[PDB]
Design a protein around this nucleic acid. Structure first.
Ligand SMILES: [Mg+2]
Ligand SMILES: [Mg+2]
Ligand SMILES: [Mg+2]
Ligand SMILES: [Mg+2]
Ligand SMILES: [Mg+2]
Ligand SMILES: [Mg+2]
Ligand SMILES: [Mg+2]
Ligand SMILES: [Mg+2]
Ligand SMILES: [Mg+2]
Ligand SMILES: [Mg+2]
Ligand SMILES: [Mg+2]
Ligand SMILES: [Zn+2]
Lengths: 59, 148, 308, 152, 166, 287, 108
RNA sequence: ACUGAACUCCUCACACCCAAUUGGACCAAUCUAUCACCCUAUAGAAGAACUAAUGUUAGUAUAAGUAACAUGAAAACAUUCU
């Protein structure tokens, strides 16, 4: 039920997920709502990925 | 350093303290020179202390060669087959006495890094923790979200 | 002596057996091709009518060349001939396993030697009952347009006035410099210019201390798949299975191109009058003429056009 | 890019390429069998065939005579080309030359080829012979051929 | 210099007991001071490593490198001495257990450069060593299977201890 | 029990091998001269009744061992693992000779023997299998045949495509095992002792002994599988590369007994056929 | 531009022991069924070719002796005859090159 | 609330964490005296200790098997041809 997560506050509209394709002009900034509509798994996935230790065991 | 050195775990030879204590040192061999200042301390030790040490340690056979090769030495052989050779060159009587007592007290196991300060063959009495200790069981062993 | 000798079919054949094997295998190939010439009498899959939003299969044609063509308004259009050579539906997969959400038809064309194909490919074509094809391309279709594997496809699957997309490997130009590859200006020929005439200038800025990914640099040019969109089908020779497609097509002559209904929004629902699953000559509803023309085409043999 | 380029770049330029091929062809006409680097032999083979065709055109043909005069640097070979080589191949329509690969040159490890005019008086080259018809595979294929002939 | 490779042919083993597997014959041969780079020789030596004598000779007879002929001559000499002096029954029953190239004694020459400057060219020499062992070439190491990989992983999982505790 | 039969046959076979090697003691040096076109005049000083044409090929070179499959010993085809008996002239025969007729016959015979082993070890214990003979069929026939009588319980059962593929899989297992083709020229008495249970093999041994002026019978073993052959065999099963049990045909006179002929086709490593040619050969061999 | 650091033997081994740099094993080497010599499948047997070249050189030496001078290419065919051979009816009107050895088995 | 230092306590042991500079305790090797006569001792000496001077000499790396270099063609090796 990761599609049915709830954000407190206005995080759905304010939280922005930033990514770069690496190419010039490839910087993409997407709000939490848009990312949720695109991938109903990405928000929980990214939260867990950020909370895990930043070592070679993370993946 | 530890990473550039062998290591072992804390151990005894034959469960050396369970039934009875067996002194692991079994042989001492003092190669001592009649002449030569290098073995003056060894000569004084042979004159004044080796007899008392021998009668204090009846389980250790002590040999005195009175003709060494290279430097005067004491070779300590232990029950587990270990051989530790210590040069007694230019050591005083008291230095040699402390060294010999240390050899008598220690076991034949290698003097290397010991991983743990303790050794249990029975680390657990109530059962080693596994993920299902402290986990409650459910009726008919139903896993979560199981229909029946 | 190590046992990894690379053998070919002719290696151990005798002078007598080489022509015999050639003729035998060629006869088997043509017999297999002829055995598929009546798909409608071989338990065809259900033939649904066309609906809006339906995508049918395309063909794999061979680029024959180019020739001029004239329209009744007096304009010259260069046209490219694409010959449909032994094009057959080979495989069908549903939406779930199509790497997406649309049924897929694998289609092949341009029969090639069985002696030069991998064992797995030969087994696949043996189960299918067809000689192996040079290229196999996957077409996204709706389930309405599913066609039984083994069915042949013909140039009359398209019709004049239709718009088409053609994708093919472009002409390979090898490792090319940046002036030819990306149209850089280069440097002047004289006025002191030494040893730099066709070289890239700066490749980045000094701050980033690196080169951005995707920076235009010398390298292999061409030999990549490109698609030309919205090309008009000007004419169809049903006898030789030729499609006359407006303008240029990527790739060289005698190269296999994948031809499919145009995906442009303007041509979204022009498939009403096209043969929906595909054209079936075995249907024999009306034997098509040797040449199907678009309305505006100045047909040869027509009296000389006068703009009266 | 060299799409469709059918001629190698040899020697010191176009004229030098022609002269190299001319020397090789003159040697081939004189000796009827020549060793040379494989690429040069492959380039010269077409000219050898065309020379035989020009010789077939006839001794009295002025264009053929001019072509032979250019392409044979030793003029004693022109009568040979017109009265020996061309009559030797009058029955044939092509394939006047035989080109085979040779162990690489010891000097520079170059890919080497021997090219000869077919029917020469020299000892035959060790040609590659196909497997005997009596081998196991060939006999099985002969069985297939016989069964197919009987059935159909 | 060192000449231990030559001496390795002069070691005599004690006679074997009847209830003992037959010791395969070993033949050490070398060529010293080959006018060739050891770095270039290494590729030929690596190529013929582990192959039977006949396979190595066949591979070397069709190799364009200068060192191929030298290695072929060394291998032929080793085969001859294996039959004559090391009691090897069959000429072909030999495989290259070891084939290496070593640096030889090299000479220094001057290479003239463009502005009165120079480099020191080295006239490089190399050695070449073979050990031939009697018998069929040992089979190549089979590639790791998924079953073997999974077994190794599960063994590693089972090897885990509770670290830094009682 | 079939296992008991195999064990007793192997025991008798090894007993005969030991008896013959003991009967031939010491090391008598026979002289064998290579009479082939290549390496002419080379003389091998071989060991009588121990050395083999394989040993002579090993002396020659590894290419001879790999390609040589039969031995004309004084003009007579010899198995590459058949111990030589006297000073003689030897010539090695390969598949790619000008006239490899004898090699083709030997390959067909050995492939038939492999098929027979597969047939014997395939079926379940309840059903009984009796290998009657491997008819000497020409290569032109398109297949090698082995005739077998199955249990009367299976007098109507015909193998399916999966059954045939299982047969081929077992044959390829034998090929992977790479078992040498051991040979013995034995006395008819010992041959009948070995095959006393099999009446068909008994009468076949009697025929062969009658044909030979003496009571000499050729016995061949791949591994744990002894059989009577009509001639020399190939060295090792690994010579076979492509191998397929193509079909099974019941013979017309079914009234006395059901003689089912297992037909298969094979090609050696030296003569691999392309996939399509092999498929056509399979189609022809299924007849 | 000069190297900024010495390249290590580890890096150098990874480079120069790459399979791209290793010598590839040839699998087209077989044995000439005629004479038993090693040959590549597409290339002539070296020993047989050397035989043919030596015989051709001898024949060409005889041809040179017969011609006696440059620019003397005959306008007629040539036939090579060995000891114990006589010109045939077809060999009439063709210059004869006489070889002192006997006819080679591979020559026909 | 807990976590949290080389702070402090705890078991044991203690001379054993500043540049320049200064005081001190030892000391490798070498030679000499006298020993030892086995490879050491007590002394007396001194060309008496090198991870560092774009140090000197020699060896060998790296760049790198890279840059660069070279032999017109066929042939009967007579010769001919370009
Ligand atoms: Mg410009
Ligand atoms: Mg310029
Ligand atoms: Mg050039
Ligand atoms: Mg703390
Ligand atoms: Mg403190
Ligand atoms: Mg100093
Ligand atoms: Mg130093
Ligand atoms: Mg320095
Ligand atoms: Mg280097
Ligand atoms: Mg570089
Ligand atoms: Mg260069
Ligand atoms: Zn040959």
């Amino acid at each position: 039920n990761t599609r049915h997560i709830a954000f407190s506050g206005n995080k759905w509209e304010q939280k922005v997920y930033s990514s770069h394709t690496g190419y010039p002009g490839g910087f993409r900034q997407v709000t939490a709502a848009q990312l949720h509509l695109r991938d109903p798994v990405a928000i929980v996935k990214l939260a867990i990925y950020g909370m895990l230790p930043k070592n070679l065991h993370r993946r | 350093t530890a990473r550039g050195t062998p290591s072992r775990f804390l151990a005894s030879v034959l469960h050396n303290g369970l039934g009875r204590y067996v002194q692991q040192l079994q042989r001492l061999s003092f190669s001592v020179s009649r002449d030569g200042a290098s073995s003056r301390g060894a000569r004084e030790f042979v004159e004044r202390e080796v007899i008392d040490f021998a009668r204090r340690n009846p389980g250790v056979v002590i040999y005195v060669n009175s003709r060494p090769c290279c430097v005067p030495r004491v070779v300590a052989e232990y029950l587990n087959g270990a051989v530790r050779e210590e040069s007694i060159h230019c050591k005083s009587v008291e230095e040699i006495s402390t060294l010999v007592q240390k050899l008598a007290d220690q076991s034949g196991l290698d003097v290397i890094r010991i991983r743990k300060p303790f050794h249990t063959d029975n680390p657990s009495i109530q059962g080693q923790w596994h993920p299902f200790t402290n986990k409650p069981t459910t009726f008919r062993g139903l896993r979560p979200r199981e229909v029946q | 002596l190590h046992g990894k000798s690379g053998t070919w079919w002719d290696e151990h054949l005798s002078e007598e057996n080489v022509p015999f094997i050639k003729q035998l295998v060629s006869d088997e190939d043509k017999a297999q091709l002829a055995s598929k010439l009546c798909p409608l009498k071989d338990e065809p899959w259900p033939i649904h009518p066309w609906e809006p939003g339906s995508f049918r299969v395309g063909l794999i044609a061979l680029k024959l060349g180019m020739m001029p063509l004239w329209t009744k308004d007096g304009q010259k259009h260069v046209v490219t001939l694409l010959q449909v050579q032994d094009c057959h539906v080979l495989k069908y997969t549903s939406k779930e396993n199509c790497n997406g959400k649309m049924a897929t038809l694998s289609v092949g064309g341009k029969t090639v030697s069985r002696f030069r194909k991998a064992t797995s490919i030969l087994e696949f074509y043996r189960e299918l009952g067809l000689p192996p094809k040079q290229t196999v391309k996957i077409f996204n279709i709706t389930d309405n347009a599913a066609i039984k594997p083994g069915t042949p496809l013909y140039a009359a699957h398209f019709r004049p006035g239709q718009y088409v997309d053609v994708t093919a490997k472009t002409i390979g130009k090898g490792f090319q410099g940046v002036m030819k590859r990306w149209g850089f200006k280069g440097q002047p020929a004289t006025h002191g210019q030494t040893k730099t005439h066709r070289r890239p200038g700066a490749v980045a800025t000094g701050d980033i201390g690196r080169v951005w990914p995707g920076t235009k640099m010398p390298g292999k040019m061409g030999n990549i798949y490109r698609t030309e969109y919205g090309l008009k089908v000007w004419r169809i020779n049903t006898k030789h299975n030729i499609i006359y497609v407006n303008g240029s097509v990527p790739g060289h002559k005698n190269c296999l191109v994948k031809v499919k209904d145009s995906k442009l929004p303007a041509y979204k629902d022009l498939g009403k009058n096209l043969p929906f699953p595909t054209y079936f000559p075995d249907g024999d509803e009306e034997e098509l003429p040797e040449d199907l023309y678009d309305e505006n085409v100045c047909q040869p043999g027509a009296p000389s056009i006068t703009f009266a | 890019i060299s799409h469709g380029r059918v001629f190698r770049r040899m020697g010191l330029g176009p004229e030098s390429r022609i002269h190299l091929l001319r020397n090789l062809l003159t040697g081939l006409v004189r000796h009827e069998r020549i060793e040379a680097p494989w690429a040069r032999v492959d380039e010269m083979r077409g000219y050898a065939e065309k020379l035989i065709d020009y010789g077939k055109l006839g001794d009295t043909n002025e264009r053929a005579m001019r072509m032979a005069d250019f392409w044979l640097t030793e003029k004693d070979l022109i009568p040979k080309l017109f009265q020996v080589l061309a009559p030797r191949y009058k029955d044939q329509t092509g394939g006047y030359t035989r080109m085979l690969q040779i162990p690489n040159r010891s000097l520079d490890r170059a890919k080497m080829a021997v090219i000869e005019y077919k029917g020469n008086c020299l000892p035959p080259l060790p040609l590659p012979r196909r497997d005997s018809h009596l081998t196991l595979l060939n006999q099985l294929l002969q069985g297939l051929r016989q069964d197919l002939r009987q059935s159909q | 210099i060192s000449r231990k490779w030559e001496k390795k042919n002069k070691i005599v083993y004690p006679p074997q007991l009847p209830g003992e597997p037959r010791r395969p014959a070993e033949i050490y041969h070398c060529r010293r001071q080959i006018k060739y780079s050891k770095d270039k020789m290494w590729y030929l030596a690596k190529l013929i490593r582990g192959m039977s004598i006949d396979q190595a000779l066949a591979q070397l007879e069709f190799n364009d490198k200068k060192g191929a002929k030298i290695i072929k001559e060394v291998l032929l000499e080793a085969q001859d001495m294996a039959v004559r002096d090391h009691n090897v029954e069959f000429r072909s029953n030999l495989y290259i257990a070891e084939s290496t190239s070593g640096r030889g004694q090299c000479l220094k020459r001057i290479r003239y450069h463009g502005r009165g400057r120079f480099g020191i060219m080295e006239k490089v020499y190399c050695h070449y060593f073979v050990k031939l062992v009697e018998g069929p070439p040992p089979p190549p190491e089979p590639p790791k299977t998924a079953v073997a990989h999974a077994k190794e992983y599960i063994q590693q999982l089972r090897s885990r201890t509770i670290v830094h505790t009682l | 029990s079939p296992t008991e039969l195999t064990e007793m046959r192997n025991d008798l076979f090894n007993k005969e091998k030991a008896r013959q090697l003991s009967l031939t003691p010491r090391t008598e040096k026979i002289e064998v001269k290579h009479v082939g076109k290549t390496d002419p005049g080379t003389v091998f000083v071989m060991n009588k009744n121990i050395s083999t044409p394989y040993s002579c090929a090993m002396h020659l070179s590894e290419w001879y061992c790999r390609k040589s499959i039969l031995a004309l010993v004084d003009g007579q085809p010899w198995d590459m693992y058949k111990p030589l008996t006297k000073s003689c002239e030897i010539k090695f025969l390969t598949f790619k000779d000008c006239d490899p007729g004898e090699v083709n016959k030997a390959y067909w015979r050995s492939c038939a023997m492999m098929m027979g082993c597969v047939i014997e070890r395939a079926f379940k214990d309840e059903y009984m299998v009796n290998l009657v003979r491997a008819p000497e069929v020409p290569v032109i026939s398109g297949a090698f045949c082995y005739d077998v009588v199955l249990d009367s319980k299976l007098d109507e059962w015909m193998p399916t495509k999966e059954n045939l593929r299982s047969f081929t899989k077992d044959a390829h297992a034998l090929i992977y095992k790479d078992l040498p083709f051991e040979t013995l020229e034995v006395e008819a008495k010992v041959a009948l002792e070995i095959f006393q249970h099999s009446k068909y093999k008994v009468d076949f041994i009697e025929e062969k002994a009658s044909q030979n002026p003496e009571r000499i019978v050729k016995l061949h073993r791949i591994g744990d599988f002894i059989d009577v052959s009509e001639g020399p065999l190939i060295p090792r099963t690994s010579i076979c590369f492509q191998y397929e049990v193509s079909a099974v045909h019941n013979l017309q006179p079914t009234q006395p007994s059901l003689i089912r002929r297992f037909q298969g086709v094979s090609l050696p490593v030296h003569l691999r056929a392309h996939f399509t040619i092999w498929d056509k050969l399979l189609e022809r061999s299924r007849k | 531009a000069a190297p900024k650091n010495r390249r290590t033997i580890e890096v150098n081994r990874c480079r120069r022991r790459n399979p791209q740099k290793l010598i590839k094993v040839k699998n087209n080497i077989d044995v000439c069924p005629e004479c038993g010599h090693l040959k590549q499948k597409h290339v002539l047997c070296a020993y047989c070719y050397e035989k043919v070249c030596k015989e051709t050189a001898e024949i060409r030496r005889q041809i040179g002796k017969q011609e006696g001078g440059p620019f003397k290419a005959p306008t007629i065919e040539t036939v090579v005859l060995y000891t114990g051979e006589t010109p045939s009816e077809q060999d009439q009107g063709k210059r004869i090159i006489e070889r002192d050895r006997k006819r080679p088995s591979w020559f026909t």
